[PDB]
């Protein structure tokens, strides 16, 4: 009776242009050859620039069926997009194969739910990275009846509204260590000598992308 989780960012289309023939025209095909959009326009780049024409974004979605805290605090799926319990399965299996063409820019898409991220990362590496960033987000938000939040709220209630606004930032340095911790971890995964860096994939802080999806800016697949 339980509804199965699936990558709910992907949408499909039937009017597209197959690959292999330069004279492909938009026609209707069988569902088994239905187009599935997997990589999206790069929101993290200014229009008309170079990286906007060189890169596409791949989103690791938000999940809810993993931990008791997945409703209050964000937690992201630890699986490669294409292996979800309710994802479309093709004949190539778990790799990404170009099948057809779609929207402006003549971007290539495969007729399954697999993602071009599969060309760079593996299941174990993605699981490790996502698990670390999950833990960082959880310990950053913290627990309700924990001393961080309760002390903050108590002194806030005492001084009206001022300790979190003006008076607090002047006095204490090292209470902001988790934000910079997550920033350092992501910047190190991104920096030269890192897993994501070597392979050609860049990650973005969940603080920038509203913490409502874990984005990987990858080269625009061909």
């Amino acid at each position: 009776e339980r509804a199965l989780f699936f990558n709910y960012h992907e949408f499909s289309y039937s009017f597209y242009e197959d690959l292999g023939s330069e004279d492909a025209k938009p026609t209707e095909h069988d569902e088994d050859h239905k187009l599935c959009i997997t990589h999206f326009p790069n929101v993290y780049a200014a229009r008309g620039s170079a990286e906007f024409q060189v890169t596409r974004v791949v989103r690791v979605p938000r999940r809810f069926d993993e931990s008791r805290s997945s409703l209050e605090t964000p937690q992201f799926s630890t699986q490669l997009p294409g292996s979800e319990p309710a994802a479309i399965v093709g004949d190539d299996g778990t790799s990404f194969v170009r099948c057809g063409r779609y929207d402006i820019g003549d971007h290539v898409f495969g007729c399954s739910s697999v993602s071009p991220l599969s060309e760079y990362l593996s299941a174990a590496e993605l699981a490790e990275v996502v698990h670390r960033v999950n833990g960082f987000l959880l310990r950053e938000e913290g627990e309700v009846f924990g001393w961080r939040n309760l002390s903050g709220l108590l002194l806030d209630m005492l001084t009206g509204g001022l300790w979190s606004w003006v008076l607090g930032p002047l006095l204490s340095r090292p209470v902001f260590q988790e934000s910079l911790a997550l920033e350092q971890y992501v910047a190190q995964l991104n920096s030269p000598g890192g897993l994501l860096h070597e392979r050609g994939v860049r990650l973005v802080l969940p603080r920038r992308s509203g913490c409502l999806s874990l984005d990987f800016v990858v080269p625009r697949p061909k």
């Binding site: 409703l71 709220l153 009206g160 509204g161």
Partner: protein, 276 residues
């Protein structure tokens, strides 16, 4: 506007009490220095927390984080319109639903909502308080509650101060009219904050934000004596105490909107990408 009304109602009883009364309570025995000090302290708390609630960040989410396609002037595909139902943990027996706000173009997290006035999607939306002039979200709910509590306490302390003053003056009420004015004003501004605080306690006693309550009111239009309890609360915790503790004392969390460099640094989160 309407916030200036409340700001005048907050700064007026200070002046009327510091021009006329806060000299015959220091060294007259018509009152207590402890009471004068407490009144001024609670009034400073109320004013500072009202300014804070009126100029704080309700927890707005960035825009256009989930774009789909650059075709047909950024047209939204079909599969994005209908609802999406996703499973929760093995414990919670109810699935959850998720929707795609077509204005900000993000997949709304659970319990977020859209404000038709400010035109942003707040994180845990309660309501758009007109007086404070802000959406009461997740990152300033504690400040809103501190404001209501400070208002109640300041009104009660001013009330008891003016009462002990009027009760101990020998010349009769014909020589202190300002004390009676302050008494009436305190007795009048003690009600509505108390009513709002009790309404919010009863709401947060069943893990219900005001938006959720007025939504679940259904076809019955009685906003007072509706059964505040429901049986399908995914976000239930077990008891009135824990529900209050998890709704009012919620952690603020990081702030998602900041560092505006409009000179083409961090774009697509400010461009008006509406269909027109």
């Amino acid at each position: 506007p309407l916030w200036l009304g409340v700001l005048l109602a907050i700064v007026c009883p200070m002046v009327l009490f510091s021009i006329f009364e806060a000299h015959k309570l220091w060294h007259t025995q018509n009152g207590y220095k402890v009471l004068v000090i407490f009144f001024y302290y609670f009034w400073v708390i109320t004013l500072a927390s009202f300014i804070r609630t009126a100029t704080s960040d309700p927890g707005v989410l960035p825009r256009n984080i989930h774009l789909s396609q650059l075709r047909n002037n950024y047209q939204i595909p079909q599969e994005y319109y209908n609802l999406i139902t996703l499973p929760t943990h093995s414990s919670i027996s109810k699935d959850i639903t998720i929707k795609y706000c077509p204005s900000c173009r993000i997949w709304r997290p659970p319990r977020s909502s859209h404000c038709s006035t400010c035109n942003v999607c707040v994180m845990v939306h309660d309501h758009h308080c007109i007086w404070v002039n802000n959406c009461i979200g997740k990152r300033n709910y504690r400040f809103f509650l501190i404001f209501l509590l400070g208002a109640i306490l300041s009104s009660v302390i001013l009330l008891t101060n003016c009462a002990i003053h009027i009760a101990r003056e020998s010349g009769g009420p014909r020589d202190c009219p300002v004390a009676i004015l302050l008494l009436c004003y305190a007795g009048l501004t003690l009600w509505y904050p108390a009513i709002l605080f009790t309404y919010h306690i009863f709401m947060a006693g069943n893990q219900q934000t005001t938006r959720e309550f007025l939504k679940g009111i259904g076809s019955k239009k009685n906003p007072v004596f509706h059964r505040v309890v429901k049986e399908e609360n995914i976000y239930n915790k077990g008891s009135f105490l824990k529900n209050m503790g998890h709704l009012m004392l919620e952690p603020r969390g990081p702030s998602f909107v900041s560092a505006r460099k409009p000179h083409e640094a961090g774009d697509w989160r400010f461009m008006d990408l509406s269909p027109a």
